[PDB]
Design a protein around this ligand. Structure first.
Ligand SMILES: *[C@@H]1O[C@H](CO[C@@H]2O[C@@H](C)[C@@H](O)[C@@H](O)[C@@H]2O)[C@@H](O[C@@H]2O[C@H](CO)[C@@H](O)[C@H](O)[C@H]2NC(C)=O)[C@H](O)[C@H]1NC(C)=O
Ligand SMILES: *[C@@H]1O[C@H](CO)[C@@H](O)[C@H](O)[C@H]1NC(C)=O
Ligand SMILES: *[C@@H]1O[C@H](CO)[C@@H](O)[C@H](O)[C@H]1NC(C)=O
Ligand SMILES: *[C@@H]1O[C@H](CO)[C@@H](O)[C@H](O)[C@H]1NC(C)=O
Ligand SMILES: *[C@@H]1O[C@H](CO)[C@@H](O)[C@H](O)[C@H]1NC(C)=O
Ligand SMILES: *[C@@H]1O[C@H](CO)[C@@H](O)[C@H](O)[C@H]1NC(C)=O
Ligand SMILES: *[C@@H]1O[C@H](CO)[C@@H](O)[C@H](O)[C@H]1NC(C)=O
Lengths: 222, 207, 340
């Protein structure tokens, strides 16, 4: 099951996610769509038969979802589609297309063994913006830490490497948090011996691909 | 139909036996089990109460009847520590997370004053580190001139670093430039459990 | 003493050699003349488990009806995904005839004489018969036509009601006629008359029998949420013409005791370009024939799929599609076993 790449939308918009199907009789099996909304658990949205395309949408997503089937003798071929209108802020998460994998006939129509690679969708009022870098200068007795503060950027992700590589010891790149401004921010610290200050150079490399922003930030003690 | 997964988080040593629950509201049916490791899509383990799928070790043992169900892992592997969901048709559980248990670890609390380059943006952010600790139950307070903050700081804790199964966390206190220049002392009280005294790292405005 | 087994059955009917009708042409060579004196031995103090959703008799009948349509109904051009099959498409008389299924030497069909039996549980009052009763192989969606009514009260049939991915079969206790009509001179415009005064009276009984299986909550009906035209509207074949009837004001109901102008009419259209239920793709037929096309059928069953999610109300939408479920509406009380 192959879906489209990651997509980001504005609130009140719509998103079309495809789901390539092969290696199984599509007309006899179903394709369910399940989204993983963070801290809320897996949510089943609906399934789609390949025969006549009967659909069963979840009640709490009416007038927002619509699933269409595509087909083509090697039958198996075809693509499933998920349309998600009425985008809010709480619809951000991983959206999977799931299907009962090649196994037993006893397996019900909800025992999904096969899962797609997943489609990440982020919906907010924010726009693409390069990150700002603030150095976290180490304090002033034995093994102190230093790091970089990646604040105000959108969207995910950001890759942080130290000294252009060759420095992957005690490095902690924390997961991003969503501020009230609607922009992400995270920290990336590195623990370092207090005797190696002033003699060793410490440089962090913050990269932001979606806004084509690259930053080589240096950190000096106080 | 309500699927209640308890306890939500379980600390198990690599080799011990884990036991998850899935007490449903309406019985007379079966239950499935799904495993999800971070970075990879959820995987089916058990379907129809107690039946394994293709390419699944026998250490995963399912059982239960009526409303009470249970997933048991005989001798937990180091790759079994993940998020587990149970399913009845369309309904799921909130999920339980298998945790690597270890001895307690005192966090090394560090504090970082906002850069002068940052102050030119009109805002100021001071952060705490307290990296490498166990378990992930910490309490950062943020006190500026003996004044407690509540609603202007965000923390971010990393998952267990497999090389020692420890945490980190990072609380960031963000303020404006005007409010930052008004005060002097910026503290960071940390109440874990390692050492009976709450470790506090602070700095005064200037240097 | 017997065991659940499976074998190749032979069909039986009353096909007439003089008839040029499709089903009569098929059933005169593929079937045998109906036995004039069928015997039936009633047996008590004997129980037996049935399962219509795992019945081999259905798959055989399915394989016979699909052969009936591949033998006669030849469209003008037929698409094979990328290639075309252009043949001749002459009009023909289309009217399904009762077809009985019997067992060869060594096998016997068991019949469940239990009145309110749905098709999954055990039967206490079971009889043995050589052949099945008159079953009309009518291909239709949403509404079941020309079938058998319930023995006494409405029977709810489903593989599993708790599963929303399984179609539901309703066994009506009282029938409702449909007066479908394609007047001759506006040529595409068709009709479908249903007595609305007795429809909301028979549809409420369906809900109340369904409300017993759902913790005393209200039940609402609505048109299907999507799919091809063969499933989104009332699809059935009459007089060789493929009808497509919109049933919006038909499933425009809510349930307490009962809830829902002239009697309810269903706007229908005739499409020459249809999707075959043989599963080979889309085909195009010859344009409709002149004259008054009238198809008086009987509503005896409804095919539903429970709209499920995170609910206190249950929503039921029409839509069968799989015609294998249509045969199960009648072959529910039949099962082939092997003698000793
Ligand atoms: C969770 O684990 C702790 C620690 O056990 C240890 O650390 C592991 C990495 C492994 O190396 C074991 O061999 C270690 O023993 C358990 O700690 C117990 O704590 C009590 C009181 O502090 C002490 O008296 C016991 O000796 C400790 N256990 C052992 C085996 O020495 C703790 O019980 C575990 N809890 C759970 C729920 O698993
Ligand atoms: C069907 O429902 C029955 C109870 O109504 C239950 O025992 C059975 O496990 C269900 N089957 C499936 C495949 O869900
Ligand atoms: C069993 O069914 C037969 C015919 O269906 C009927 O004549 C008979 O009375 C039934 N048995 C009982 C005990 O009612
Ligand atoms: C059919 O009737 C049996 C009674 O033996 C019952 O157990 C089963 O749940 C019923 N199934 C449906 C779908 O009503
Ligand atoms: C049936 O008619 C209604 C109007 O009452 C329309 O909204 C609906 O789309 C139609 N369904 C079809 C054509 O399948
Ligand atoms: C039921 O019919 C009314 C008008 O008769 C219509 O407004 C409404 O949309 C219908 N309900 C549906 C189609 O679910
Ligand atoms: C049902 O039977 C009647 C009378 O036998 C017939 O007129 C009608 O065409 C049949 N229905 C279908 C869909 O053929």
């Amino acid at each position: 099951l192959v879906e489209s790449g990651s997509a980001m939308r504005k609130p009140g918009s719509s998103v079309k996610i495809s789901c390539r199907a092969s290696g199984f009789n599509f007309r006899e099996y179903s394709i369910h769509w399940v989204r993983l909304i963070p801290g809320r658990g897996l949510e089943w949205m609906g399934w789609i038969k390949g025969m006549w395309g009967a659909v069963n949408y979840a009640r709490q997503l009416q007038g927002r979802v619509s699933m269409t089937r595509q087909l083509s003798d090697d039958p198996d071929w075809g693509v499933a589609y998920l349309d998600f209108s009425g985008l809010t802020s709480g619809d951000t998460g991983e959206y999977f297309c799931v299907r009962k994998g090649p196994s037993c006939p006893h397996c019900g129509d909800f025992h999904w063994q096969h899962w797609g690679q997943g489609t990440l969708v982020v919906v907010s009022t924010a726009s693409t913006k390069g990150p700002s870098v603030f150095p976290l200068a180490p304090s002033s007795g034995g093994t102190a830490a230093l790091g970089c503060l990646v604040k105000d950027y959108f969207p995910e992700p950001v890759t942080v490497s130290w000294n252009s590589g060759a420095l992957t010891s005690g490095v902690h790149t924390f997961p991003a948090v969503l501020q009230s401004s609607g922009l992400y921010s995270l920290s990336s610290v590195v623990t370092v011996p207090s005797s190696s200050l002033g003699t060793q150079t410490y440089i962090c490399n913050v990269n932001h691909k979606p806004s084509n922003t690259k930053v080589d930030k240096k950190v000096e003690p106080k | 139909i309500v699927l209640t997964q308890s306890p939500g988080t379980l600390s198990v040593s690599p080799g011990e036996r884990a036991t998850l629950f899935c007490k449903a509201s309406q019985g007379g049916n079966s239950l499935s089990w799904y495993q999800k490791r971070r970075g990879q899509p959820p995987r089916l383990l058990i379907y129809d109460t107690s039946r394994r799928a293709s390419g699944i070790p026998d250490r995963f043992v399912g059982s239960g009847s009526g409303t009470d169900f249970s997933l048991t892992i005989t001798k937990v592997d180091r790759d079994d520590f993940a998020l587990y969901f149970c399913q009845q048709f369309e309904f799921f559980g909130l999920g339980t997370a298998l945790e690597i248990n270890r001895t307690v670890a005192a966090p090394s609390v560090f504090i970082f004053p906002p850069s002068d380059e940052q102050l030119k943006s009109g805002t100021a952010s001071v952060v705490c580190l307290l990296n490498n600790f166990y378990p992930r139950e910490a309490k950062v307070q943020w006190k500026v001139d003996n004044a407690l903050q509540s609603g202007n700081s965000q923390e971010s804790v990393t998952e267990q670093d497999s090389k020692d199964s420890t945490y980190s966390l990072s609380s960031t206190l963000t303020l404006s430039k005007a409010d930052y220049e008004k005060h002097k002392v910026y503290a960071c009280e940390v109440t874990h459990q390692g050492l009976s005294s709450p470790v506090t790292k602070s700095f005064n405005r200037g240097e | 003493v017997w065991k659940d087994a499976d074998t190749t059955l032979f069909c039986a009917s009353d096909a007439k050699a003089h008839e040029t009708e499709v089903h009569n042409v098929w059933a005169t060579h593929a079937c045998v003349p109906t036995d004039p004196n069928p015997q039936e031995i009633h047996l008590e103090n004997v129980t037996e488990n049935f399962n219509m959703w795992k019945n081999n008799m259905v798959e055989q009948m399915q394989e016979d009806v699909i052969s009936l349509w591949d033998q006669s109904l030849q469209p003008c051009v037929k698409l094979t995904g990328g290639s075309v099959i252009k043949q001749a498409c002459p009009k023909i008389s289309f009217d399904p005839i009762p077809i009985h299924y019997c067992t060869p030497a060594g096998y016997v069909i068991l019949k469940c004489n239990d009145k309110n039996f749905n098709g999954t549980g055990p039967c206490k009052n079971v009889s043995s018969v050589q052949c099945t009763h008159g079953i009309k192989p009518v291909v239709s969606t949403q509404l079941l036509l020309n079938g058998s009514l319930a023995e006494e009260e409405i029977i709810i049939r489903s593989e599993n009601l708790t599963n929303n991915a399984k179609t539901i079969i309703v066994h009506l206790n009282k029938s409702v006629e449909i007066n479908c009509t394609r007047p001759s001179n506006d040529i595409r415009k068709a009709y479908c008359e249903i007595n609305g005064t007795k429809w909301n009276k028979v549809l409420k009984q369906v809900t109340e029998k369904l409300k017993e299986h759902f913790n005393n909550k209200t039940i609402i009906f609505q048109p299907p949420s999507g799919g091809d035209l063969e499933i989104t509207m009332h699809h059935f074949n009459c007089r060789g013409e493929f009808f497509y009837c919109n049933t919006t004001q038909l499933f425009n109901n809510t349930c307490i005791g009962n809830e829902t102008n002239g009697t309810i009419t269903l706007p229908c259209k005739i499409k020459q370009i249809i999707n075959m239920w043989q599963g080979t793709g889309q085909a195009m037929y010859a344009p409709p024939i002149d004259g008054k096309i009238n198809c008086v059928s009987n509503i005896t069953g409804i095919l539903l799929t429970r709209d499920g999610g995170a609910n206190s109300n249950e929503t039921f939408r029409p839509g069968g599609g799989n015609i294998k479920d249509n045969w199960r509406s009648e072959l529910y009380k039949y099962k082939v076993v092997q003698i000793e």
